Structure formats: structure tokens, C-alpha cells
Write a protein that binds this ligand. Sequence first.
Ligand SMILES: */C(=N\[C@@H]1CCCCNC1=O)c1c(COP(=O)(O)O)cnc(C)c1O
Ligand SMILES: */C(=N\[C@@H]1CCCCNC1=O)c1c(COP(=O)(O)O)cnc(C)c1O
Lengths: 439, 439
Amino acid sequence: QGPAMAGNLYGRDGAAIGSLQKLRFFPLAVAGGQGARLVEEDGRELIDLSGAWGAASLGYGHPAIIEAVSRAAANPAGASILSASNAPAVALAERLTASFPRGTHKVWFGHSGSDANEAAYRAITRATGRTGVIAFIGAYHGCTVGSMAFSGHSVQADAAKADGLILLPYPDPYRPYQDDPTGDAVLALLKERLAAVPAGSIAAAFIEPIQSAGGLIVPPDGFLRKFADICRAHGISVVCDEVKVGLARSGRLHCFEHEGFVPDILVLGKGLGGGLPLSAVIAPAEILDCASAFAMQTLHGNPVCAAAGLAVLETIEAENLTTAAERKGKLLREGLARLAERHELIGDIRGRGLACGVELVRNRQSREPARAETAKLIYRAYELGLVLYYVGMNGNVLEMTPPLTMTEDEVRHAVNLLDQAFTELSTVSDTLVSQFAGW
Amino acid sequence: QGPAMAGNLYGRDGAAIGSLQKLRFFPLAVAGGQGARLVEEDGRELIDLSGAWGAASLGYGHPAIIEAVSRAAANPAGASILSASNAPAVALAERLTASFPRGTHKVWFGHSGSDANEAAYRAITRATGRTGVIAFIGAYHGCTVGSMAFSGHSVQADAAKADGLILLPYPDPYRPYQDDPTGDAVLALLKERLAAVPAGSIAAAFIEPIQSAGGLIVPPDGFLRKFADICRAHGISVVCDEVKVGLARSGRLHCFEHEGFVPDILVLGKGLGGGLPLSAVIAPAEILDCASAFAMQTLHGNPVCAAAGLAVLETIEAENLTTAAERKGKLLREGLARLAERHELIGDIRGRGLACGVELVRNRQSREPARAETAKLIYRAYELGLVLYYVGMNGNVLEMTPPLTMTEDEVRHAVNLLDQAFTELSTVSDTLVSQFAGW
Ligand SMILES: */C(=N\[C@@H]1CCCCNC1=O)c1c(COP(=O)(O)O)cnc(C)c1O
Ligand SMILES: */C(=N\[C@@H]1CCCCNC1=O)c1c(COP(=O)(O)O)cnc(C)c1O
């Protein structure tokens, strides 16, 4: 790399910021954003089908986010919820509880999905005395020591795991455990694992209602309701992690609304803040009131980020974004089915609303994953003006989680750009794509 | 509590937000802020001597924070540093490295002091193979599982601790370990503890250059330089946690500038974001480049919070805030010495710049701590229109960490309000103050 490429924004990023937190697939180097488009240092525009991993729920520069953040910065109700009550945080907590099936639940605020899942686990173990926990292989609950302890994805494979962690296979309709498409075999497994440990010893069960980093996997019909029944028969708290697929994105406000059960605890994050760091736990009062000064960080519940979160909730109502996500997700999956009529690499199209996955395979009969082709496809897409990433334990699932405010015209254009990327993925050399580590 | 007090902002906070993250001393209930003043729901103004635990470095509604946050919200360079480079984060990383003694160091971004200390520990252990760590009793490095593992304060007393943690007494001039005012006894202790464990087994040593939650303790002259010499003789990385006392507050830009040594790693947070969630690690490249996709959260390096951090650094230069903090801290400690000529409860006045502590005792000869009187004093202060909190393992140290932009006139008025609070602390009943748990 010569001095011009070293001196550009991507080169500067390599010299100034450590690799420790990087997850890079192509040399995306951003200086601005407007609507559903990113703008690079050189001025090139790109359509963002990733929506910053679902964080950009209202896109970039939405008037309701500008209004809220500018107003709170000019007259901030202090900087915290720890040693003061503040008006924006309390208003946000009452709006979140009103959205969840009155009187029984309170809120905890954090910065991230990692800190929220960690606080939910510590609180249950403090309040019940129980130390064990159930979660899934492929599950992504965070990237801190406390949240990696009950995760199951490759990012957390070398982390220290909780005492009494029971890790189960997540039932995948495309690759079913024990060749049982229903998931009943995973339920029977859970019952056997509970019998090998002392009774009443499990505090909690963490579940994603659609596994995202694990592969954009929607579980079989009725599995999650049956799983939640088992847990309730053993006195185990059911924690629904909606950090990625929550808050209108599924075509219902809360993803569990598709699944015929109500969890004990709901965890929120990513698009809750609209581009600012904001997470929440909605839990029984007895769980969140078992201690004080116990799980706290100084800027938790700051009024700037709370104002952004109130703007996201208000805009979901005012712009009818739950219905929009349902309608636009149908249009996107219809487009992708037309591409599958010519591109044999597409093996499966799945998801809910504007949480969509397309699984790439070397052959439709064998279902053998196509990792190398997936990495080149998204590189070619980036060259053509479209940003998307891949997920899954085999690296072969394209993920689409656009801003909820993406237009229909933008959805159609993105499908057309993807068609070209499928046709021309082999134009990206082996040597170029190997400069990006991915996951 | 009747329905009017239940329906006010503090009552609403009790019904909607769990106690789990609360650290409350009096019923402070904020709806706005301007300069160094908070405004409650009812419209009452208070002068904020806590500066939101040091987070409000530029006070409330500072024009440079309004400009930066409003500009970035209207044209945001995406939402993250993980899967994209972005211009505000890279500019902030280059400004932070330029401030630290060229070529050798890079940056990691987080949301909090907790996540920054955790990432520094994981990175060293990954890059060196070493698992052991040195820290201090009373040390506060965070409130997450990964950061509590090498903390020493009462908040973290029941947390799981790292394998190979060596916890040492922090040398306090007012209460010296082994009756040695120099701290040489703590240095000799460290040498013995290193001899009982395998050679080259310690990864890191974490130190606060002024212990804040531990009691606003400035260590004896030359201790920290000698400690850093020992660590370097054993190949141990020296991590200086300046989350609380960093970035101009001590009267030097970096607190270690008072102490005659340069650390290997510098950790920053709190006032770095000016009221938004922002932390940083400045570390050798080989430490931060040992892995990718390793310590990452989705909103890390978001452009709104990075723009706020660039505004804090720029304002420290433009308003000459390092010199201001030195000058105003002298004025504050001179005022407090005048109060000690009439209020026998004051046993010691200490600190650097605008990081000040006043230790309250039942008798000046015995030095017996005065916990109950300290809790009533800050309650009375709150009634009179002044916000401050207490710290220390014995609950008897008043902490003052005001906005760097507090005026001299505001400092004098705050001293006058404190004089009245000392005179009238006994007017706060036992039953009233016991409704607030504190720490
Ligand atoms: C977020 N999951 C990952 C995060 C890192 C980037 C790769 N893409 C993903 O979608 C997440 C979290 C953790 O939230 P945090 O990153 O803000 O700490 C927790 N739970 C779920 C389900 C997800 O997706
Ligand atoms: C911050 N310390 C505590 C934080 C909780 C409120 C009580 N007052 C204090 O000053 C801190 C941290 C942790 O940063 P975080 O709260 O943003 O996670 C880490 N290191 C130091 C030295 C301090 O003070």
C-alpha cells in the first residue's frame, strides 16, 4: 500500500485504531449519511441493507432523532440515572412498560445488549439464589465476560462459561437436529439435561426468537411456546433477547408476538437508540429490586440517549413502521425468490419482516455451505454501491436488516444490485477478499 | 407517601425503574440543566459540585457539545466502528494518540470505564499468554463481571475475582500501612507476593493515580514511579486508570504527569464524553492488534459520541481548562481550610486540581470516621441548593469534582452553602436520611 491509500480514511483507521474490536469484510470508509444511504470519504453513495447491524432503525439524519438529540444536548437533565432521577429516563421506562403485557414489571437501563443480558443474569441469580442457566449453540448474547458466559456462537467459543450452563442445539428447519423438523427432539433433550442436575437449580433460560448471528434461523412452529412451558414447570425465568429482531422489525412490535407465549424478561438494544448507545431490561419488580448499587455504570440512563429512545418509540407509532416492516419484508422476499429462479447458489430464503436471511450452498440437494462465494458476493456488492454482511456458523448466510424507513423503491434497487453481484462474484480475486478477516 | 409525592418525578422513578443500578443519597429529581446548575421538576435550581461524578466536564448545555452532537445527528457517519471505518472516530483516535507520549500506540473505543478496563485486561492476557494481575484494595475499575474481577472496593466485594489476582493496600498518607508514611512497606509487600508465584506469570498492574471511590487518596511522593519500576523489572504492563481524574481535572492534562512516570496503557472515560457514553484505551499496537472480532459491541465508536469527545478535547485547549482547574482548585481548597478553622468535623483536605476530598472525623486526634454525620451533611446541602456526594471505605469523605467550566463566583457560593450545611447537619433527622441507601 502506497502513501495515497495509507493516507485515506481506511488507511488512517489501520494506523490509529486497534484490530481488537474490528469485524471487516471490505474497505467501507464513511464520512456521512442521509436516509438509508451512507456517503464515503470520497463522496460515493451506497445503499445500506445492513442498517448498521440493525442499529440505524430510522436511518441516518431522521428529523425525529435530530430534534430529540439537539433538544436534550441544549438542556440536559443531568448525565445519569444512578445518583439522580431524570425526566427523560423515567418517561422512557414508563413507555417501555406500557408496551409489555401492568404493575408487575420495572426497567433497568444500559449502554449495550451485552451489558443488558449480563445484568438480567446477575439479577436473577441474586434474587432466586440459583446459579445455573440454559442457552443455545449459535446464540449471541454479547461480547463481555459476563455475557459471553452463556453465549454459544463462535465469537464466544474460547470464553469462560458459567457453572451450570446447559447449551442446547437451536432447531433449524433447514438442518434439523436428529432429523426431527418439529424440534421435539431438542425439547426431549432439555428434559434429560434437567434430570441430571439438582432440582430448582436453574435460574434462567435465554433465547433469541429468531437466531441472528447463528444464521437468521426462525425456529419451527410451536417450539418456543413448548420450551417456555418446560421452563415454567421448573420455576425457570424465560428471557427473550430481542436486541437484534425487536421493536417493529419483525412486522409485530415484539417478535414473541408471532410465537404464542409471553416471556418473563424482555431484553432490548441496537435500534432502540437509533444510532446512540441504549439498551433496556423489562423484568419483574422482585428481580430488579433485589439489591441497590449492584449493576451500575456512570452514564447509564443519560438524558441524550433516553431522548433518542423516546424518538424511536414515537416514530414507530407516527410512521406506522410495524405495518411498513411487514409490507416491505414481503416485497424483499418476493424479489429474492425471483433471483433464486436464476442463481442456483441460493438454497433458502427465510425470516420475518425486515429481518431476512439468504443461505448460499454449493448444491441444492447436498446443502453444502458456500463460504468462499458468500465473502466475494458481499465484496462485489460493496463495489457496486450496496452494503450487506454475512452471518452463520458456516459463514454462508446473507443478512438484510435495513432501516425501517427504507423505501419500496430502495428495496427494488437493492435487489437489482444483488442480482449483478451474484452474476459477478467471481470477478473478485482470492487475494483481494483475503485481506478482510470477517468471521 | 401520599399520591402527590408518588406522582412526582422521584415517585414515578420508584415505580418505573428497578433499584439494581441506583446509588441515591437524597431525592434529587432533575428535568434540565444549564452551566454548572441542575434544575428539578418543580423548577428549583441547584449548583452541582459533583459534575455528575465527573461526567459533565463542560457542564450542561455547553455550546461546543450542542454544536457537535447536533451536527453529527443531522449527518452521521454510520453508527459504528466495527464493520466500517468512520471519520469522527478516526479523528478522535489520532487526537488521543497525539496527546500521549508517536508510532507505538493505537486506540480501542468503548461505552464506559468498565468496558475499557475489561478490554485492556483481556487484550494483555491474549497477547502475552499471562493470566495474573495486580490491583489495590479500594480500587474501583468497573461494575461488570470482567472489570469487577480485579477491583478492590466494597461495590465489588462479593464478585468473582481473577485467578492470580494480587490485591495490595493503597498507601494513604492519613492512615499509613505498617505506619510507614512513604509507602515503601507496600513496595516490599509487592516483591514478596511476586516471589510466591511463578516468574513471568503476571500480565498487568492496574492503578488509579488518585483513588476516588476508595477515598480521594493521593499516594505518597514517589510511590507510583517506584511501583512502576518493579513492574517493568518483571515484564508487567502498567495500566493507569484515569477514568475519574483524567483529562485536565488534575491541573495537568494527564494525572500521571504529576507522578514522574509514563504508563504502558492509559484508560479514559466519564468526562471524555461530556455527558455522552464514551471510553478509550491507549495501548501498544502489539496489544491491541493481537486478535480481531474479539472485544466488540455494536455501537462502539458511533459518530455522535465520537463528535462529543472531539468537542471536549477541543474545548480543554480553547478555554484553557488545564490552567483553570489548577487555579480554581487552589481557591476551593483555600476556602475549605477556612471552614476547618470553625468546623472541627473536618480532619483532612486533599486532592489535585478540581478532584478534591474532605475527610470527616469524630475527633482530630483519634481520626475515627464520622459516617452518620457525612450522610446528613450532604442531605442538608441538597435542601440548601448544593449537590455533592461522599466516597471512601468508611463513608466519610466528601467528594468535589465540579464541571471544569464552574466559575470562581460559583466556587465561593458553594463553599458558603457548605458552611451552613456543617452548622445545620443535625437538623436532618435519623428517620429522613435512612430512607436513602447510599454506599
Ligand atoms: C448484537 N450482535 C452482533 C454484535 C456485533 C457485531 C456483529 N453483529 C451482530 O449482530 C447482539 C447483542 C449484543 O449487543 P451489543 O453488540 O450492543 O453489545 C446481544 N443479543 C443479540 C441477539 C445480538 O444480536
Ligand atoms: C467510575 N466510578 C464510580 C462509578 C459509579 C458511580 C459511583 N461513583 C464513581 O465514581 C469509574 C470507573 C467505571 O466507569 P463506568 O461507571 O463508566 O463504567 C472506572 N475507573 C474509575 C477510576 C472510576 O472512577
